[PDB]
DNA sequence: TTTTTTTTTTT
DNA sequence: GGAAATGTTGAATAC
DNA sequence: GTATTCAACATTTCCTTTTTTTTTTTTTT
């Protein structure tokens, strides 16, 4: 599971984020995240070496 | 005070010896007469080189115009049908208008035959008067002396009146000291609000019974405060305008009079015509945006009852607006306009809603979602709920919002247009304010006024479809102001072109004269498209032959004769040199370190514009030491795209240093002018530079812009033959008027970069002129519709101007548009017939390939264009196979989205009749005209133009994205249309199908040409059409009746078929559950019925199966619909009769 | 536009000494004044919320003396019978004094000379057509209905006794056609009741 | 209106201007400017809404 | 309303006034009230009273 | 017949 | 919560 | 108005351009 999550800081609180939530849900679950912002370049196309890092990740 | 009859004795058949370029003109409009008639109009471009002669022809040919009026008045006096034509003199710029207006003045004054006066004085104040200037309001008002407008407020009883008189003491008070800037812009804005409202009171003044009698001292001051006056008396017919104003209109003492609505029998001679485009589209760009969901409810709430008077003046009116009240009804009842609309769900308030589409096609939505529309009766409202469909795929089903915004638009612009055809109904501009008002009033619609007064200057598969007739509109839809709880759609539209701003011009009656040098530049961001103008006005688009562009060829060259008197031409083509400009900022800051360094610190330039700085300033560093070092070249004039003022005097500091180190070395005095802006020409005339060339001695060097230089600005100078040296030769065979002057002999041209048109001016917030661009492109092939709508959708999405720029890049219109500013840049410098010995062009290598390919007619180019060309070319990919090829394309989606419409129109019971109509047209133009030799006018849409003549090979998903089909042979293997493949050969053959196919006019065969069907019409519409005519045609002779399927289910079933002795009702379909579901929805309204499925064409021994209501097999007798499976024989074109005599068997056991 | 008419209005104010550039000016301040106040209070009705503090919210509080009063910074407010009669902005609106008169104290200098003043304010309302506006209210009113939501309660039941009255009104008068003078010529004189 | 207080104070007047319409001679409007209140009812009513009013002049009660 | 003019008088002068009426014509009609004499007497009591903003007054005060 | 000069504010 | 690996600011220390 | 040590988040790269790189106008309201 990629689970595309905001900021974690903006989330006020533990049960309000998805992140550290589905977590201790799915206790026995493959999972990564990331934030919507880092797949653009400066010009806006798909970063492919985020995509790379993700799934070796 | 002069009278006509002072010309009773003037010869008007003695004129001045007519220079090649009024020769051409005057024989291209005899042509006109010859081919178009009389009374039509007319478009003459004339790519006239300004400098030799241009604005002299115009003006001799206007004054033509005007001795030619005076000549039929004199000889037609007695016929008593006066006409006083109209001739006008408009182009962009206030300033030219006045120039032109004061050289016609002069040119009245001073022309001479033969060595004597052509005009009397008595003659010349006749001329003089009967031309007339007419700028803007404030301006108009302030030009008139205090006793004018006094006597004016005295004739018509507004002196008394108290807030006139205070506002006329005010403006008085500002205008004697408004030699203040800052007072200058108030005295303007209240000079104009002044002009209106007393223009106002002298109208309501005139209307009516209390009509002031203008004469004498009255009617003077009144004309020189509204000379449009003078048009409406008689006493002018040559007015001077800009463009904004001709399209504004001006106004006499009795209403506005716009010159678009009377252009029958104009003449009108537009200067630089190609700049005209963008300065129309501006000012159609300025239109109010108008709320469609109040618009709607407002037409439906007073269309209801409202209803006119039943008088003679009325008469057909109402019958024009009978349609509109039944669409309104069922759009008003389809939609639940009885309640108001909102947004639910999806958060409105962080982003709007926007909506591009340009009523064709390539429909974009700023949402991500399909946006539907619900009507709660539980509540009262109309919910736009968001369904959470993602922005990848917007090619899913239509939504509801979409379809309801373009319905709204379509009777929004019908109620528009109806009320055009309900003024001339009414009904020559006289009557159109009293129309409009009446027409109004009854129908309780008083808050369209401005609209319409607004728009009024300004079935599709069957019509000439186009862009140009046609424009965009865009939508957002956002809460309304104050509420929370409702929401508007406004609204903003382009309902044409300017190029069909033009065409229309044209049609009206105008006979046009466009002067430009670059008049038919191949580009439509940057000029009128010609492709469309042509395909419209036909032979209306006059041409100047290939005799006549040798006559100008041979007589520009006898004026600029370079050749016969020694003039060169060099051009150098620069790239950076890095290295030269690290010497020079070494020596500009000698105890620095590194000249990365100085550029970063000294300079100003941040790390990322360092090299794009090394780049452009490297080259123009080494145009100006090329230039200094120069023996005798005097005038340089740098072309950059940025201008170099006091924001980048860093930059200025290093230039000018580099300037003074080459000024020392090669030990001649060198004047820089740096940031000669359009407000420092405004400031400090250009004429500093002229007077410091006329008196000082060594070289000067002045920097610019593109968009500073532009047309009508003279930067010629006075020559004072002592500080010139010898260099100055004339190349002109014949010289009369001396005056000594000379003109640029050294230019840098820098590469053009920000092409897209882009004003930044608050009207250009909604980006509608930004997306007449890709529309524009798309609609001339430079673009594929994927690209055209891609490119739509990110400008809907919010787009930079650094991409916006490479998606224009990448077209040919692009380099068209760049060879365009490099033509008009050498052009303009090029004004007077002393030259140097030689001339230096430097230039921008980034403009080597770009002129590499200018393969034009070089017969009216100028001769520093032509050197520039030729150079670009001695150190050496088609445009019209890739506009045919995105035109293939363009042409399939258009009918491909067309059809579909058309289809779930028809779908939607009941069928309108106009719908019906359209869909046998179509049917009727495929049947009779698979190929045509022309390209069509009526149904331009149906046919692609081929590559090869007859046939085309194409793959693409005819169900799929329509944005990625292919065509000609970037396909070798793949589908294919032809005669062949739709089986006609064999149809014909039938000794039943041929005596129908010939007797209705049908193709028997596909004659070789040009223009081909797209594969939307050849597989949906041609095939189908082909097998309901092969099996009526065979059926009709076998005693079978044929009478329409009516409108409740039409198109499911090709035909009602009757058999004579057979009363159970019958139906055919020509070629389960989806089949089975017609088979109830027919029954339900009429009854048991028989059903025929039958296939034309295919193998005939194949057995006759019978199936019943479920389309499961059954027996004959207790069967409900009957699957012939072949009619014609595949091989042989032999009827089947063993299928239709079985068939009227079983029809038999009924 | 807001930095052009700005500067010009400054460039105006510079001298300002000749009677007819104080009347432009005043004319330019009023209508600029307008703009500037209808755009802020864009900004301050929406969600991009300026935060006013230090040094300029005093800048708002001099340049909207009214917004003091909001504010509850100020209480006491010096101004005409016209101005009270037409009331004073802040950052969300006009604020009418006549509408929230409940429990202020008003002392009028001269209160007999008001009666003038105040029928002077009366008299330059605008006129209004009422064929036009009887036809425009029985034509809206006819199907057009509020949504029936918990913040229109009670609403609809206000206005369905007019949509009766209107519907009457419109079928006794023939409202579906317009109306015109016959006979006796009204362009020479026209009627006034 | 007789079961309720009468007066012109709150009832006002009417003038009405029937003229034919701007630009057409064939339609008719209805012109009516309106004087809903008297300044002594938007006195009051300034009193019945809670407003305490001190009204000074040395001709106050004229 | 106040009582000033009986019924029959105001509605003349209201007739009077839509048909156009010259100031002097309507000043004779306002003339004939006592409410005019009153608003006299309140010009002259104000005029008067915006003249004796002191308390330095002359032994002889004349009012002509 | 009676017999004038004053004013604010938004647009 | 792209990763690792490099790198700099601010903060506490603090001699 | 200190100097030195050090822990915490930024930044660039990545199966290698972010892309192109501006000034200019008329008219009514
Ligand atoms: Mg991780």
Redesign the interface.
């Given at each position: 599971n990629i689970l595309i999550v905001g900021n974690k800081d903006t989330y006020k609180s533990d049960e309000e984020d998805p992140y550290q939530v589905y977590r201790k849900k799915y206790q026995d679950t493959v999972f990564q995240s990331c934030y919507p912002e880092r797949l653009w370049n400066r010009?806006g196309q798909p970063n492919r070496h985020v995509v790379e890092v993700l799934l070796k990740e | 005070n002069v009278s006509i009859e002072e010309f009773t004795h003037f010869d008007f058949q003695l004129v001045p010896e007519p220079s090649p370029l009024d020769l051409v003109i005057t024989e291209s409009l005899k042509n006109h007469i010859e081919v178009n008639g009389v009374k039509s109009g007319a478009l003459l471009p004339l790519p006239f080189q300004t400098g030799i002669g241009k604005t002299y022809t115009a003006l001799n040919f206007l004054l033509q115009q005007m001795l030619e009026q005076v000549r039929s008045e004199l000889k037609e006096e007695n016929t008593g049908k006066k006409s006083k034509r109209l001739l006008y003199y408009v182009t962009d710029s206030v300033d030219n208008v006045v120039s032109a207006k004061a050289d016609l003045l002069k040119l009245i004054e001073k022309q001479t035959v033969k060595g004597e006066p052509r005009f009397t004085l008595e003659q010349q104040e006749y001329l003089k008067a009967q031309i007339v200037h007419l700028p803007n309001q404030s301006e108009q008002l302030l030009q008139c002396s205090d006793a004018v407008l006094n006597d004016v407020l005295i004739g018509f009883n507004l002196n008394a009146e108290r807030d006139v008189q205070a506002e006329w003491?005010?403006?008085?008070?500002?205008r004697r000291?408004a030699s203040?800037?800052?007072?200058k812009?108030?005295?303007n804005?209240?000079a104009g609000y002044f002009y209106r409202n007393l223009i106002d009171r002298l109208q309501?003044k005139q209307?009516?019974?209390d009509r002031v009698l203008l004469s004498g001292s009255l009617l003077a001051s009144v004309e020189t405060l509204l000379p449009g006056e003078k048009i409406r008396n008689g006493s002018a017919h040559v007015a001077f305008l800009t463009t904004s104003k001709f399209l504004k209109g001006f106004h006499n003492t009795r209403s506005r009079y716009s010159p678009l609505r009377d252009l029958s029998g104009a003449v009108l001679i537009i200067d630089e015509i190609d700049k005209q485009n963008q300065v129309i589209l501006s000012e159609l760009c300025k239109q109010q945006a108008q709320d469609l969901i109040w618009a709607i409810?407002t037409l439906r709430?007073?269309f209801?009852?409202?209803?006119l008077?039943s008088?003679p003046?009325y008469d057909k009116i109402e019958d024009l607006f009978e349609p509109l009240r039944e669409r309104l009804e069922e759009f008003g009842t389809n939609w639940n306009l009885?309640?108001?609309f909102?947004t639910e769900g999806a958060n409105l308030?962080e982003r709007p809603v926007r909506l591009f589409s340009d009523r064709s096609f390539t429909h974009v939505s700023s949402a991500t979602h399909k946006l539907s529309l619900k009507s709660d009766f539980?509540?009262?409202?109309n919910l736009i709920f968001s369904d959470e469909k993602v922005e990848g795929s917007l090619i899913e089903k239509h939504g509801l919002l979409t379809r309801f915004v373009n319905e709204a638009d379509v009777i929004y612009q019908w109620f528009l247009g109806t009320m055009r055809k309900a003024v001339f109904q009414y009904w020559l501009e006289g009557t159109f304010?009293?129309a409009?008002?009446?027409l109004l009033?009854?129908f309780?619609l008083?808050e369209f006024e401005s609209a319409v007064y607004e728009s009024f200057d300004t079935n599709k598969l069957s019509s000439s479809k186009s862009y140009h007739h046609t424009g965009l509109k865009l939508v957002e839809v956002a809460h309304n102001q104050?509420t929370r709880?409702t929401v508007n759609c406004k609204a903003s539209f382009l309902n044409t072109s300017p190029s069909g701003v033009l065409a229309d011009m044209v049609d009206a009656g105008a006979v046009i004269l466009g002067i430009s040098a670059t008049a038919r530049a191949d580009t439509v961001i940057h000029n009128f498209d010609f492709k469309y103008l042509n395909e419209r006005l036909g032979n209306k688009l006059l041409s100047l032959s290939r005799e006549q562009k040798q006559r100008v060829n041979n007589y520009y060259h006898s004026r600029r004769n370079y050749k016969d008197n020694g003039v060169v031409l060099t051009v150098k083509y620069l790239n950076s040199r890095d290295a030269f400009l690290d010497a020079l900022l070494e020596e500009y800051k000698p105890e620095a370190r590194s000249s990365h360094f100085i550029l970063n610190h000294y300079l100003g330039i941040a790390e990322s514009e360092q090299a794009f700085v090394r780049s452009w300033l490297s080259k123009l560093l080494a145009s100006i030491k090329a230039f200094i070092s120069s023996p005798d070249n005097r005038y340089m004039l740098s072309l950059l795209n940025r201008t170099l003022d006091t924001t980048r005097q860093n930059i200025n500091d290093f230039i000018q240093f580099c300037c003074d180190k080459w000024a020392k070395e090669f030990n001649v005095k060198t004047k820089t002018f740096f940031g000669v802006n359009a407000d420092w020409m405004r400031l400090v005339g250009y004429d500093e530079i002229s007077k410091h060339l006329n008196t000082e001695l060594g070289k000067v060097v002045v920097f610019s812009t593109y968009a500073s230089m532009g047309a009508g600005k003279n930067p010629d100078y006075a020559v004072n033959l002592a500080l010139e040296g010898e260099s100055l030769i004339s190349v002109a065979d014949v010289t009369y008027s001396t005056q000594l002057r000379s003109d640029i002999d050294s230019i840098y041209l820098e590469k053009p970069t920000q092409l897209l048109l882009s004003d930044d001016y608050?009207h250009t917030a909604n980006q509608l002129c930004q997306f007449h661009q890709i529309l524009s492109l798309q609609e001339n092939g430079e673009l594929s519709p994927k690209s055209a709508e891609n490119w739509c959708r990110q400008q809907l999405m919010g787009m930079?101007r650094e991409?916006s720029l490479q998606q224009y890049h990448q077209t040919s219109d692009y380099q068209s548009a760049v060879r365009k500013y490099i033509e008009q840049a050498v052009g303009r410098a090029g004004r007077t017939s002393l030259k140097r010995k030689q001339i230096l062009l430097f230039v921008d290598s980034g403009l080597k390939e770009i002129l590499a390919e200018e393969s034009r007619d070089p017969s009216l180019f100028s001769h520093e264009y032509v050197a520039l060309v030729n150079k670009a070319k001695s150190a050496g990919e088609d445009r019209a196979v890739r506009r045919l090829f995105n035109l293939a394309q363009r042409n399939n989606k258009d009918g491909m989205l067309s059809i579909k419409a058309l289809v779930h129109r028809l779908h939607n019971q009941p069928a309108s009749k106009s719908d019906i109509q359209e869909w046998q047209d179509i049917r009727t133009q495929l049947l009779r005209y698979p190929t045509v030799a022309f390209q069509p006018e009526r149904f331009n849409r149906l046919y692609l133009q081929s590559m090869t003549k007859g046939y085309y090979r194409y793959q693409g998903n005819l169900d799929g994205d329509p944005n990625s089909f292919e065509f000609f042979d970037r396909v070798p293997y793949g589908d294919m249309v032809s005669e062949e493949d739709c089986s006609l050969a064999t149809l014909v053959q039938n000794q039943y199908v041929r005596p129908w196919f010939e007797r209705k006019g049908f193709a028997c065969s596909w004659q070789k040409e040009a223009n081909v069907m797209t594969p939307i019409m050849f597989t949906n519409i041609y095939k189908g059409a082909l097998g309901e005519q092969a099996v009526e045609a065979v059926l009709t002779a076998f005693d079978f009746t044929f009478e329409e399927v009516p409108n409740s289910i039409y198109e499911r079933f090709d035909n009602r078929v009757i058999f004579a002795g057979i009363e159970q009702p019958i139906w055919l379909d020509s070629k389960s559950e989806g089949y089975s579901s017609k088979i109830a929805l027919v029954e339900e309204e009429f009854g048991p019925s028989k059903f025929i499925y039958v296939n034309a064409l295919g193998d005939t021994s194949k057995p006759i199966r019978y199936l019943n209501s479920c389309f499961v097999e059954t027996s004959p007798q207790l069967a409900k619909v009957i699957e012939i499976p072949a009619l014609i024989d595949d091989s042989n074109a032999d009827t089947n009769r063993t299928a239709v005599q079985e068939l009227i068997k079983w029809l038999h056991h009924s």
């Open positions: 010009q | 003491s005010a403006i008085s008070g500002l000291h203040n800037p800052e007072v812009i108030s005295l804005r209240q309501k209307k009516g019974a409810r709430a007073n209801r009852d409202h209803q008077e008088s003046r009885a309640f108001a909102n308030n539980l509540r009262r409202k304010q009293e409009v008002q009446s009033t009854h309780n008083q104050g709880d608050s930079s991409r």
